[PDB]
Structure formats: C-alpha cells, structure tokens
Amino acid sequence: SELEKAMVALIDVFHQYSGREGDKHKLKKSELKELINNELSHFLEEIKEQEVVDKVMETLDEDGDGECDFQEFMAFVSMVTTACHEFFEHE
C-alpha cells in the first residue's frame, strides 16, 4: 500500500538519522537542531540562536525529559501536520 511506504520510510529515515551521533533512538537538542535544518527547513526557518531552540525544545518535550523520544518525535512529526492547515481545499 502507499501508506506502507510512508510508514516504512519514516522508520528507515529516523533510525538512520538517529544513528548519526550519540546512542541510537535518542534525539539530543544539538541533534534536533540538525534534523530541523536538514529535514524541516523548506517550510520553517527562524532558529537563528540556540536560545530560540532551547525555548522550542523545552516546549517540544512534553515530559521535559530534555531529549526528544521516539514517541514524542512522532508528535512533533504530527505537529507539523496539525500545525499546517489544509491548503489543498483551494482550487
């Protein structure tokens, strides 16, 4: 199914991406900054100072674990979905 590739694509991208530095399956704030710059950047910019990341990162951490777990990581992935409104409703 087309959704199977979408789901499978995310895991393959996450584990390969999460295995860049530090323990696998653990996104650090420094690692989070790299992911946003490389992955989410064409639709969102800003982030010019670490303090801007510290506020967003702490807010991102629902449990305040200081890092972004796989479970929350899916939330942020969804937030990018729930954040953007449907723009395909216009001709």
Tell me how long the chain is.
Answer: 91
Q: How far apart are CA 78 and CA 87, in angstroms?
A: 16
Min separation Cβ 32 and a copy of itself, Å = 15
Q: How many C-beta atoms surround the C-beta of residue 72 within 10 A?
A: 17
Min separation Cβ 49 and a copy of itself, Å = 25
DSSP state of 45: -
* Known binding residues: 15, 18, 21, 25-26, 31, 61, 63, 65, 67, 72, 85, 90
Query: Which spans of this chain sit near a copy of itself (rule: CB under 8 A)?
Result: 1-7, 9-13, 15, 39, 42, 70-71, 74, 77-78, 80-82, 86, 88
